[PDB]
Amino acid sequence: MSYNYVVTAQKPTAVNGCVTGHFTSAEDLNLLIAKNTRLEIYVVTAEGLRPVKEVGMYGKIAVMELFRPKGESKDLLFILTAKYNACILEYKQSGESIDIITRAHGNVQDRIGRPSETGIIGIIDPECRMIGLRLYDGLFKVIPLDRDNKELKAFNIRLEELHVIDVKFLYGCQAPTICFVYQDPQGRHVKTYEVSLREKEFNKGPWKQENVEAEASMVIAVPEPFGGAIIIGQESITYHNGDKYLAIAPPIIKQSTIVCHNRVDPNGSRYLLGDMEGRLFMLLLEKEEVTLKDLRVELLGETSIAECLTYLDNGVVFVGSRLGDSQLVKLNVDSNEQGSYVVAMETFTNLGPIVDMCVVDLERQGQGQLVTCSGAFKEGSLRIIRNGIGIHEHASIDLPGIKGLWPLRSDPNRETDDTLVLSFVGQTRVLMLNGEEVEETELMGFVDDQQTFFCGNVAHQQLIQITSASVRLVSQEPKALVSEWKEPQAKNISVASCNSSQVVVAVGRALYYLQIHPQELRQISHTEMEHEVACLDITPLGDSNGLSPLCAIGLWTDISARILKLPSFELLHKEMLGGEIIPRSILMTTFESSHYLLCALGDGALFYFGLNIETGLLSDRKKVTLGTQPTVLRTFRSLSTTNVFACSDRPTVIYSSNHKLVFSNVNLKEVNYMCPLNSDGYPDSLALANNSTLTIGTIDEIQKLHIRTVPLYESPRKICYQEVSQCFGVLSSRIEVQGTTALRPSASTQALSSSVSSSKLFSEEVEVHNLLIIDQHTFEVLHAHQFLQNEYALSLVSCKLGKDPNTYFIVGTAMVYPEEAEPKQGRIVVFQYSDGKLQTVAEKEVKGAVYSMVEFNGKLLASINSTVRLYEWTTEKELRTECNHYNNIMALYLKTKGDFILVGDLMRSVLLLAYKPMEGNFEEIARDFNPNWMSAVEILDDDNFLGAENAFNLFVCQKDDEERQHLQEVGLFHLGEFVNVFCHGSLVMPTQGSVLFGTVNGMIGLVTSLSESWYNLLLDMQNRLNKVIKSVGKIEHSFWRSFHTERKTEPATGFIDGDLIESFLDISRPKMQEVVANATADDLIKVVEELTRI
């Protein structure tokens, strides 16, 4: 058996469905977005969207509709999963806590049935008397709702029309009436049935069948004043109410088919319609007294290619795209002088269909960096993805041993931090940093003969300084020191803390509380505590008055984070931490919900607790180990909120997103100290002090994965990296219509240089395929080599062949003519990139599409339609066949390791081929004889072959007389994503190997091998987390990860869902203790942390 660990590096980003309604509360307007397995609940504010919850379904969300049963206060959510788990979910918020309770659940799969072509349709009666599901041909599954089920017992009604295109429930009908477009051999017709829940059968509909357009594909139920339906077809929009039959054939909608729609109003006087090109139309119903007088369609503008779109309010439309970035657009009443009313407000990153990718160690670091062909037709792009915050440094000053950083506004009028005070060993150094100029000057009011433990700007246009002996309150406006407080015993200050109003200093084992007032430093609260002081923070949070009411301390020999009551310095709460290393940093910070107290040790351990403004009680202890060196935490307010920077040998930006603490890495060497800085020239900038210098950089976003976007405006298909040439070869495809004309300026049409394929070998809308050479620094299209008319560039490999030293871009193509089903012609072109031009070094006309190429020990291994052949690169610079293998249906995927070739077939699924070099021919080592339709293949080890099935499954084959020719599927796992690419590499600097993969939905996942010991341990934990974690639809994890195909279903095996394991950190201590019944929990934290690092 094989042991594999699958984890999600990037959650899916493609939006397959969105609905709006009052889900989170009766007064709120929610936007619920289904990304493949993630459900995102947003609240539609007057500006943007404020996320409230993001839950992960154990299922691909196929249907998602909000409905309000009689008596319900707020909307319930119906979700159907691709595996046919139906659930009705309610949002129950109990104060701070947010829950998604499963009001009902079930599994609605018929044991047999032809899953319908058009796909799962799920509709709800507008009076919530039933949910209709069209899952299979010839059946219409009904889940009644007036009968309060908890199991959603569902019954089939035999639907005599076997090919139903779309169906909706009509409005204003005494009984639940479905209206559906169906296809029979005589054409497409719209028919209506009334569903009788008591007779559990259909009845004659209100209005007879009507013969409609040949491609009538969408039905819109129109609300109560009008009723009836609007059938959208390819060329016409028709309206039916039983006697009224309006029809328009707007020429403007003929260019592309309308794929999503949405009702802007409640009475349906206006509908948004999105087509496959990204146009957005408004369909208007003009009423007459009420009946409907006439229909109008007008083109609002352009958006991302919408899968779904939702009208929120005030003209704001959420454009849900599977192929591009989703957009949040606005509808203005008037045009923008270019004919468009659509104005994009926001863009949500979507690594669209990741069709190919490579991990390049670009920037010559030790870190991989994915470069993905993301997106599609108009939305095509290259996305560059790395696990780093991105220092983005602008200046530096070589000052050694900087143990203190504080921003200062030396100029009184300016509110900007245009000065920085620094402490090194025993003195104070001021820096002016005026604009971009940086210099070392002395500021009035600061002692240069004593160290600065702390200093900062305070209220009353005042500064304050805490040195090792005294505290000096600098009156910036009038003159030098006027208020100074000195410890009565002339004891040195061991720790300091201060905010905009007050002060707390530690002298030995005693604490002093000082409050800053104009020309006054008044001591109020004082005590001499049990042990020495270690670290402090009194930063007010949610201040609202001018003073912080609480205090946080760290003590010696009783290693613990204590809390104190500020006016009296009594002991509020104690959490014991332990260890032989004293606390170093203590900070309290708001992270998106409430107050958290972050305390760290000298070994990189760091503890975050949930703190309250009344009691000051630390709850939900969770511990996280970052770094191997002491840490300090500094607060900086970015655009969105405050984010804390853990300064250590492993600097990390710790912030909270979606009401959870996620830690982002910073990828420089080391950071002793940091402080925020917003100078006239440096906005929201940082100042990272290390042992040597002070780097002054900003950080772009802190999302763990930084995603650059290189818009191509054309569908990219393949990508390979040529290091010697410092470029990416990207096969792209753009759609031109007519001789031919580009519909838009794509990256291929806007290259520096260009060229066209002039080949002597072979003698509506069409796809033009190009080879783009893209600079790997600036990502500009250095060159665009257009391929022949009707030539599809499929594969692209970069390699050096034979013995010549040149590195070649080798493209495999096929000739596509509409008269044929399989290319009979294709060619392999060898290009060399030099002098900014792309010369054609060689060609080889082959007799099929070259679906895949891999360079194979200096030889070229191509897979023409069903044959896999090996080419040799002769000294003459031409490709010469060496050996063939013909035993394939269609060799689509090829991988290589040494002498072994893994051939993924279209439907025979893997064949381990070996090139036996002494003879010069291939030999079938083994084959997996199951009929798995591959989407990709990979080689993990000398004897493990990963494959991705087209039914969203991963399987591992393993080299096992004639039964030695049977590869054994020792691993099985339902991923839920359609994997397009595997590739060795990892995005970061216990587990063996690392295979990344990209999916159609934008998931980037990572497969790695575990050992048997680790695998057994984690499988047992996996079972217990299933016993503890409660899934949203009460779906079983085992069922979710069960290998699933229409003719097979097995429980997973040999695979660890790393996602489920890593959820082990997101649970409270009692539940964790329940998980770890039969070694201690902190040990498993060691394991799961070590696992999350990969």
Added chain:
Amino acid sequence: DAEFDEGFKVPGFLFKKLFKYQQTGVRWLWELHCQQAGGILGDEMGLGKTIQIIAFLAGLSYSKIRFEGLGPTVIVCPTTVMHQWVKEFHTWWPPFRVAILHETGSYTHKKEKLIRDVAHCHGILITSYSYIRLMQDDISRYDWHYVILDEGHKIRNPNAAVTLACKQFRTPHRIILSGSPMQNNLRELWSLFDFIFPGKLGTLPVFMEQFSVPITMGGYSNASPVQVKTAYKCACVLRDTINPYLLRRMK
């Protein structure tokens, strides 16, 4: 109230009186009704089978499950226990109309009028086996819902006129109450199982050849051991075959 699998409710006050085995029998009777198959309440004499039938019919009419709830049922019993059935029905479920088709009777008009009235009123017609033989022309023209035969072992002779008469009822819901549904040989069992569920035990020749000769011939004193094992084999086969439709509780 007691709620069974799909829609069957028997009233709580009525259910409480029944013993554990009696309500198990009611459960079994309604499972048969769901299967639209007949059965034999083989519980021995005195264990209570009139009460189980009365409770099941009361729950069937009460539960409102052509016929809404309970249709017109006919109960064929020996002449000495007709008024016994009337008394039990009146005491246990007084809502039922329970008429006797017999010379004693209560009608005082043409009998055929009584059968018509009970058929069109969804009442319970208690009759004798002799009357079923005699009035088979009229008794089977009305689409009865239940054809309970009390002491249905009277149907044991497959060629008796009473058996051929009782096997004319079209309904699937055929029930026999008899604490001894086998008295002389396996032909009797075949006759009873032909009445309740015509198909399970096949045609009488086939049942003879497959069960009667093997099972009987292996019980004789001079039986060879191989023949004894064959009889054991056939008896086990037959027991498994008749298990779902025979409910026989001992004392």
Added chain:
Amino acid sequence: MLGFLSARQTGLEDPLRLRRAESTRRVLGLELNKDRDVERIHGGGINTLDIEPVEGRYMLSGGSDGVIVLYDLENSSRQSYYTCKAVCSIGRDHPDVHRYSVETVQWYPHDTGMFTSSSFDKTLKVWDTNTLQTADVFNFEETVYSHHMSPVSTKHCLVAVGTRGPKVQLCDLKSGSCSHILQGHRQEILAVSWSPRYDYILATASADSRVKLWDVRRASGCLITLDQHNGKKSQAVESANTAHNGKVNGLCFTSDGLHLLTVGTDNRMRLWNSSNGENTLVNYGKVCNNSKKGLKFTVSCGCSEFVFVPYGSTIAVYTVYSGEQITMLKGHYKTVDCCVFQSNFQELYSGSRDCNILAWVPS
């Protein structure tokens, strides 16, 4: 097709689209196998074939000489040309060989460790596939024309047997009970087939020109009798309501089990709504058959549906729901007795009176 691959990669089309479209294209390109062969061991015509439902690797074949051959269809060799070798054989030297022609052989569903074979020697034998010994025998008073186990029953394990007797026998694998019979036919029951959709629904076709659907749990005879006209020629049910104008010698439920294909000796195939037996009036033209015994024909699965009917010495491929004639697979030298469809790779195996099993593969 590169359009299909591109749409699958870009998510434009569900992979279901490519899978079923390519399955249909493969079935349309069915042709005599270029590089495949099947080992010849039957001395007489092959009356029946059955590929196991799970893993689709092994194939049973019953010959008119009474032998039962078990083939491995997988190409365990490295060449592109291979012969489907015979793994096992109930030959003439086996102690339990059928004395007369084997007319139906069927793998046990849910497990390949057992199969069954019925012969004109009036026996339905249940064989352990591992030891290759008869686990059980069910003797009948009259010759068996066909038998079928339910491909769906996790609960019951009944074998429906149609003999020249007018009764459909139901032989229970559990507690060996062959006494159960269904009454309502009048002549030899030439075909029987369990519904793939409904557990207890059995369709039986007999020489009385009638097809009856039974709920075997029920005590009240057949559920539906198929009628050509659906009521145009309506008469009290004694001789009317015939499925065909001849002997109905073949049954086949469609893949979903929502329709039933009946072939009769009136040179007609008909498609019936399996829920109420209504004739769908799909034409199919003239389907030549004159077989005096059961005719075994199968339907395709996992395609964008086809039916492969023996048609003289050929295989006629029709579209089930339109009736349009796809093609004639023409490679047999005598009348074709059976064809069995491998759904994994859209392959076909046809047995005929010429002592040959021919494999048809997509080109």
Added chain:
DNA sequence: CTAGTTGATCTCATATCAGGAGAAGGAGCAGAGCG
């Protein structure tokens, strides 16, 4: 009216070579006669 007694009648159940002659049908061949 109206129940109780009296006879007839039916069902059901209890084991263990030394004829001959003629008439009606079917069979195979032969030819005639026409498309």
